[PDB]
């Protein structure tokens, strides 16, 4: 009473479990016991493991195979062979009338002449598709009569959304299968997982693994990788480190630096950001800021103090890290401070989720923010801000021109400031926990000694919008008077950037501070913001490159100095 | 009366949550009365009070923590010794 | 036997066979063989032009010539479109004239949703088939069912099931298991409890 | 709010004792009163006392259902309309966990 | 190996076999013959392919190579299973 | 060439803005398509001499964001249409 075909096309977990070739199974005791409890029934023994990819469903199947041989089952499963199978391997051919149904009939005929096979199907949400879609002899329409009478015994393994989508075929498929929810393990659970089988990858790679190594593996896989679960991520980082260390040994100990190195190579943040700033990024974040940001030093030290206060603090993790509103004119540095801190908080930022609330002018415009109802226009994706954060829920949100919101949105804002994690989507609850909500404010420029401006702007907020609203917001970062010498300073910074760019193109330009001063005076007016300066320096540099390359007056490789010696830009190339 | 009561309750909850970090903290009743003194029922209640306890107590402890004065296992009280928030830090 | 899923269509057909053996059936129905004609086991080995309908021709000729044979078909809605190929003479058409003339003596079991989906709108074959609907037993009929069925579950779990427990299982299943149907969901409760108790007795 | 608390407790013990009306819900309440009195904190208190995570509380914010056509977000949109398949932001939420606090 | 056609993906496998002949490869991957598959030269093709799988079981040092892997996995009938076993 | 860009919307506008920043658009597969030697010429009517020389920037900075203007290579404006 043996099974030729089923053994030919389905791996026998029991057989390779005899040989101790199977890796250990750690934890999951409650889940495996529940699996056995379901398998012990008489009519529908089939459990369907519902979780997320990479959580350890197949690990639970392996553990069950283990406990079978290791005399752990309650003698109703004693000597029963677990066989993993995949329908994809079964089908293998569709251009012919009945080949597939023939394979599956053979398989059923072997399950008959046996009692010890419990066929573990991975991703049985694909058990309904084969052959005709929903009106012909698919796989399910021939499994169901056997499944309902205990003829066949099974262990399915789906994903939650696949269960929800492909148990709309309820009638048979649901009642034939009992769900067993398996959830992804926590940090500590996963650390113990790893400590279970460190002596497997150690023996495979002949490399030594430390405990802080796997701690960093788990912490890193959580912080810097998403769209992948545990213990998958962890064991994968560990094994990648094992292989890479083995190679480096040729042309014997994995440590946290290697874990950082593999995570960096995966996601793209540099290694210096991951490892060394792990608890000192807040220690030098003010240095990072005052490097990237020039001016408004009082504002930047206020922000630094607030973020390190919330950072090395006991604040409720649930609600968002920082709620700051910048009062000031435009062009004073609102975005630069944001990008700088984000680059210092979430290293290598590219993360400021900017939203212009002046675009969400009116009442119904808030549906553009959250999304349309189901039976209405533009509902499928929608959710500008909601989908934006749902994508990467680890960043810094900047909301431009908070004033221009109709009062309809301030409600959503205060809900967010009420512990975040707002459910403002088509059934999606987005979480704003590690984020930082920042709001570009109104003019507020007229009020801008220190205490005077302060009381003024507080009253302007009283008159402007709710006191309760700012009672929600943490800090009021005031963007003081426009730049006077910081003008020339930011000219210098941009020109340093542009000189680097011009140098890597095999040139060298050095503009003296007199020309910098002239560009400063021209570019930005006293009333106007400091933004056109970008354009001003662009036009001057494009003119000089245009003329000098067109005229040919200059030769490549000769340093280029600009001055205002004649009252105009004079270029002395030599 | 219920307002001072809920000051007491919020302080208790706050210490409860701070026990996550193994920090030992106490609030004198004088601090509780002073904290409630800002909250008034004239307009509305228990919103300004919660924000006030959060701000004063937690931010002040964070200030005296990043200044390095206290570590875990120490005993701390925020007291009003002169009519305004101050830290006694019985340690 | 159009009805909801967990109601016992297949159970009804089996009850018919059991009545056949017990001799309770009428004389005209006495000594007939109920067969479970699966389509998966029929359309299997063809992969050619003239083999599926060949098997069905031979099956029909046997049935016509064989005196006493009833044919029970689970998931009747698979007759339509069975032998789907270039040849495209599916089982539903090979049987149609013989079904209507009355020689082939079928017993179809389907699911009401499958009935309305693609045997009601898409067939015009709900002519050769009398739709005798089957629906949930009452709260009391389910009790009688399950209590009549209690011996097998005793045997399997090797425990003893107190009848108050059966009453309670049915009454609770009625209140809040809304998605499923009786006696299926009641039996599920009894069965899982038996498994839990046996497993407790083990450890 | 001894009155509110005892009312809620009576409701939950009616439910948990074998006496509640099997037809209609465990209990229905309308919590009137000024802003900030704690009439939302009672809901969290109740879910915590009756469940664990206290996030089993299914919460709807009727400040967003003002446009009077969003009612097609509680129950799904009709058949031939967008968002018919994933319908019931409220209905499915409650279908999942039937022992919960709305 | 994912890439556009003609970018030299198979060239990478070739240079790999080269570095295999040399010592650049570490020891675990030492003694590894890289081969390919002629679907043409191999009712009976299943027999020959299963024989190939027997020889794969014989010596566990035969790193195989597959071009156009999608249209290959027919052979999947015993390759995809043999992948799972290892 | 993009004609009637004014008829666009802030989302497709941000799309073409980050394009004009690097040309790298990624649609339907994340395809990192390169804009190596392409030309980006946008066409519209905000005008509809010196007074026009001013009103053009007026309705540009007034019709959409100034950063997209600041990704200028050159702006070609012809007012007179009859001669
Ligand atoms: N408790 C555990 N015991 C053994 N392996 C585990 C455990 N938890 C996670 N894993 C590892 O996670 C990986 C993926 O788990 P698996 O169940 O195969 O994912 P999926 O659920 O998509 O099949 C496996 O390699 C497995 O070794
Ligand atoms: N404090 C500062 N340090 C460095 N650069 C600054 C500072 N303030 C403004 N800038 C310059 O201003 C420009 C940012 O303009 P932008 O942020 O768009 O203005 P706004 O925030 O009003 O929209 C950047 O080029 C930046 O170099
Ligand atoms: N009696 C109370 N016990 C505990 N917390 C309370 C109490 N009264 C008010 N609160 C606090 O006040 C807020 C409750 O006010 P809430 O009912 O939400 O007001 P509204 O919904 O009208 O804005 C929460 O922050 C809550 O913790
Ligand atoms: N890095 C390289 N060094 C040397 N030759 C290369 C390199 N990349 C590609 N080639 C050449 O490409 C040709 C074949 O490319 P091939 O790998 O067959 O393309 P594909 O990957 O699409 O099959 C070979 O002649 C090979 O020498």
Residue numbers in the entry:
A (entry chain A): 158 to 408, 469 to 665, 681 to 806
B (entry chain B): 717 to 807
C (entry chain B): 206 to 408
D (entry chain B): 513 to 614
E (entry chain F): 206 to 247, 255 to 285, 295 to 307
F (entry chain F): 615 to 662, 682 to 716
Give the exact sentences the study uses for this entry.
Phosphorylated arginine residues (pArg) serve as a degradation signal that is recognized by the ClpC:ClpP (ClpCP) protease, a quasi-proteasomal particle critical for microbial protein quality control, stress tolerance, and pathogenicity (Trentini et al., 2016). ClpC carries out its quality control function by acting as an ATP-driven unfoldase that selects certain client proteins and translocates them into the protease compartment formed by ClpP. The ClpC protomer contains an amino-terminal domain (ClpCNTD), two AAA (ATPases associated with diverse cellular activities) domains termed D1 and D2, and a coiled coil (M domain) inserted into D1.
To stabilize ATP-mediated contacts between ClpC protomers, we used a catalytically inactive mutant (E280A/E618A, referred to as ClpCDWB) that binds ATP but does not hydrolyze it. To resolve the functional units of the activated unfoldase at higher resolution, we performed a focused cryo-EM analysis of the single hexamers. The resulting 3D map had an overall resolution of 3.7 Å and allowed us to build an atomic model of the substrate-bound ClpC complex. The most prominent feature of the cryo-EM reconstruction is a well-defined, 80-Å-long density that penetrates the entire ClpC pore, proceeding from the top of the D1 to the bottom of the D2 ring. Although it is not possible to discern side chains, the density should represent the protein backbone of the captured mSA-Kre substrate, comprising 26 residues present in an extended conformation. The six ClpC subunits adopt a spiral arrangement, engaging the substrate in a similar manner to that observed in the related double-ring AAA unfoldases ClpA, ClpB, and Hsp104 (Gates et al., 2017; Lopez et al., 2020; Rizo et al., 2019). Five ClpC protomers (P1–P5, P1 as lowermost and P5 uppermost unit in the AAA ring) interact with the substrate through conserved tyrosine-bearing pore loops in the D1 and D2 domains, while the “seam” protomer (P6) is detached from the substrate, transitioning from the bottom to the top position of the spiral. These structural data are consistent with the previously suggested “hand-over-hand” translocation mechanism (Puchades et al., 2020), according to which nucleotide exchange is coupled with substrate release and upward movement of the seam protomer P6 to rebind ATP and substrate. In conclusion, the cryo-EM structure of the reconstituted ternary complex provides a snapshot of ClpC in the process of unfolding a BacPROTAC-tethered substrate.
